[PDB]
Amino acid sequence: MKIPKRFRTYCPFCKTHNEVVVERVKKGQASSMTHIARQKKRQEGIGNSGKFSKVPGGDKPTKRIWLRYRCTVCKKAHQRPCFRAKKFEFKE
């Protein structure tokens, strides 16, 4: 499973066909100031705590490949529905 580093595809902002650069979308780290974290602080007391003592869930046999297509003119990225592959070479 390869895919070119660059190719020519419609840019939804420029509304024209021109080169794009493909890259990998890396999952960030959850911050501590969102309201879920504040709720987790407010709900920690004595004993059980509901959602925040849930065991972590399982996983699926193969995840999707999450990619971001960034234009080379306006530098504005856009995302597309992603396929599912095990080994993903990124064939420039």
Residues that bind RNA in the complex, under the rule CB under 7 A = 1-4, 7-10, 12-13, 15-17, 25, 27-36, 39, 42-43, 46-51, 53-55, 57-64, 66, 68, 76-87, 91
The C-alpha atoms of residue 9 and residue 2 are separated, in whole angstroms, by 17
Q: Is 20 in the site for Zn ion (CB under 5 A)?
A: no
As a three-state string, the secondary structure of 22-62 is EEECCCCCCCCCCHHHHHHHHCCCCCCCHHHHCCCCCCCCC
C-beta of 21: minimal distance to RNA in Å? Answer: 13
- Taking CB under 5 A as the binding criterion, the range among 14-22, 34-42, 48-56, 84-92 that sits at the site for Zn ion is 14-22
